Amino acid sequence: ERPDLAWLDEVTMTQLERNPYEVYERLRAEAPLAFVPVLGSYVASTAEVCREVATSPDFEAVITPAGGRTFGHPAIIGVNGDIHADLRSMVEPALQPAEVDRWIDDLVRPIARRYLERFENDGHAELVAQYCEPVSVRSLGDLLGLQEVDSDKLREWFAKLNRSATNAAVDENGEFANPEGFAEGDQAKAEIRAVVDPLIDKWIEHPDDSAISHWLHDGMPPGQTRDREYIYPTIYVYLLGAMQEPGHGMASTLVGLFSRPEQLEEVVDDPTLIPRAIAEGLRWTSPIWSASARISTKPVTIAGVDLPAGTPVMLSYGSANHDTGKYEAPSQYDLHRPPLPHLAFGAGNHACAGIYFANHVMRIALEELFEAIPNLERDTREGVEFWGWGFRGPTSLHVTWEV
């Protein structure tokens, strides 16, 4: 469509999944708002355009097409107006900072210890599978009321939901190129229903302190609950991004710290710097890289593009967090970067609802990890592969330490 961007026609999904940064660097210089054929959508790549689209009164939330096929309605990420306000009201109580501070430490710290105890004396570990992901899912799972769902199962569900919700590739007719990729999303949803429908059955008659029970009961007239079909899409949104991203964020922070060994040493010596290390990790490899979207409600002009009403725009926050108009050498992890704003949690009315919770989950897990294994070192004989365009993180993180 845009003639000087004809090279975009040769960009593939695989290339974006394996490393999107080269394409998006060109996009930030050539076309901060650009239609990307394989994605079938306009894409916002700079911090200015992302921030503008995310906060504009001329835009409302929309779900990406593969996200919609995966989550259905009403996914909190893709609804507006009254439904959105109800769902925000539904999820916000356990995420309130004053509430998180009451219990986050007794929640996450014993969990981190239980997983650290399985390997802290081995001298080698794969931290993604053995620590980062389990701590992340076990923490949220217990908060939700999924105490009896195994870590390994929560991790399998978010991986399947991941691949389904990012199955974004379209052919030249605008149709999904790989419709089979939605099947494992459908299978994960089916397993989730078989496991969670009995829990909802119980919570409806016997409410408890689990978050999902509060989603059913909070703000409802006496004897009434929100219909399960009304809350399931948001349960799926949790069982993907809320389960996956704090694991991705702490693992990416570790990889960044390993890439700067004197900063890693500084953080191990002074664990009060862990929150600053995590914030730079989120900027350096944003866990939610390009999975949120908005849609114009009016005709709008963004970055010299005139958009008709009803135009979706994907927000590639992960690219915006490497904006060289904001940062010096963004592809380099640097703990001592000035604490500038970043977009790893989004912006506007649909900005992440779990920021305060997530930052504490990541802080505590890194605290316990560095105290258990202060001589942690990356295994230089293994490579670290980052994967993902919609959600991005390291596929594994092999480490060693002298025992």
Ligand X SMILES: COc1cc(C=O)ccc1O
Of these partners, ligand X, ligand HEC, none, which one is at the site of residue 249 (CB under 5 to 8 Å by kind)? ligand HEC
Pick the binder of ligand X from 139, 263, 285, 292 (CB under 6 A). Answer: 292
Give, in order, the Cα–Cα distances in Å from 43 to each of 33, 38, 40, 64: 6, 11, 9, 11
Task: Name which of 134 and 354 has its Cβ closer to ligand HEC.
Answer: 354
Contacts of 366 (CB under 8 A, 6+ apart): 250, 253, 254, 271, 274, 277, 278
Among the residue ranges 26-34, 35-43, 286-294, 381-389, the one whose residues contact ligand HEC (CB under 6 A): 286-294
Using the rule CB under 6 A, is 340 a contact of ligand HEC?
no
- In the shown chain, the binding pattern of residues 155 to 194 toward ligand X, with x for contact by CB under 6 A and - for none, equals ----------------------------------------
CA 115 – CA 369 distance, rounded (Å): 10
Among the residue ranges 32-40, 109-117, 329-337, 342-350, the one whose residues contact ligand HEC (CB under 6 A): 342-350
Question: How far, rounded to the nearest angstrom, does the alpha carbon of residue 347 sit from its chain's CA centroid?
Answer: 14
Using the rule CB under 6 A, is 252 a contact of ligand HEC?
no
Task: Name which of 36 and 291 has its Cβ closer to ligand X.
Answer: 291
Task: Name which of 169 and 347 has its Cβ closer to ligand HEC.
Answer: 347
Of these partners, ligand X, ligand HEC, none, which one is at the site of residue 347 (CB under 5 to 8 Å by kind)? ligand HEC
Using the rule CB under 6 A, is 245 a contact of ligand HEC?
yes
The residue count for binding ligand X (CB under 6 A) is: 8
Of these partners, ligand HEC, ligand X, none, which one is at the site of residue 54 (CB under 5 to 8 Å by kind)? ligand HEC
Using the rule CB under 6 A, is 320 a contact of ligand X?
no
Mapping DSSP onto H, E and C, the string for 298-352 reads CCEEECCEEECCCCEEEECHHHHCCCCCCCCCCCCCCCCCCCCCCCCCCCHHHCC
Task: Determine the residue with CB nearest ligand HEC.
Answer: 346
Give, in order, the Cα–Cα distances in Å from 136 to each of 50, 87, 151, 201, 365: 27, 23, 9, 26, 9
Give, in order, the Cα–Cα distances in Å from 120 to each of 238, 248, 257, 366, 380: 30, 20, 19, 14, 19
CA 77 – CA 66 distance, rounded (Å): 13
Task: Name which of 215 and 370 has its Cβ closer to ligand X.
Answer: 215
Using the rule CB under 6 A, is 276 a contact of ligand HEC?
no
CA 127 – CA 133 distance, rounded (Å): 8
Task: Determine the residue with CB nearest ligand X.
Answer: 241
Pick the binder of ligand HEC from 53, 116, 347, 369 (CB under 6 A). Answer: 347
Torsion of CA 163, 166, 167, 170, to 10 degrees: -170
Using the rule CB under 6 A, is 181 a contact of ligand HEC?
no
Of these partners, ligand HEC, ligand X, none, which one is at the site of residue 146 (CB under 5 to 8 Å by kind)? none
Pick the binder of ligand X from 43, 62, 235, 240 (CB under 6 A). Answer: 240
CA 131 – CA 402 distance, rounded (Å): 19
Using the rule CB under 6 A, is 256 a contact of ligand HEC?
no
The least CB distance from residue 237 to ligand X, in Å, is: 4
Using the rule CB under 6 A, is 242 a contact of ligand X?
yes
For ligand HEC, the binding residues in 128-167 under the rule CB under 6 A are 140
Of these partners, ligand HEC, ligand X, none, which one is at the site of residue 240 (CB under 5 to 8 Å by kind)? ligand X
Pick the binder of ligand X from 241, 246, 247, 249 (CB under 6 A). Answer: 241
Contacts of 126 (CB under 8 A, 6+ apart): 396, 397, 398, 399
Q: Which two tokens stand for residue 164?
A: 């389904």
CA 243 – CA 224 distance, rounded (Å): 28
Mapping DSSP onto H, E and C, the string for 160-210 reads HHHHHHCCCCECCCCCECCHHHHHHHHHHHHHHHHHHHHHHHHHHHCCCCC
Residues of the chain by 3-state class (helix, strand, coil), percent to 5: 55, 10, 35
- Residues engaged in binding ligand X (CB under 6 A): 77, 237, 240-242, 288, 291-292
- Residues engaged in binding ligand HEC (CB under 6 A): 54, 76-77, 88, 91, 95, 140, 241-242, 245-246, 249, 282, 287-288, 292, 317, 344-348, 350-354, 357-358
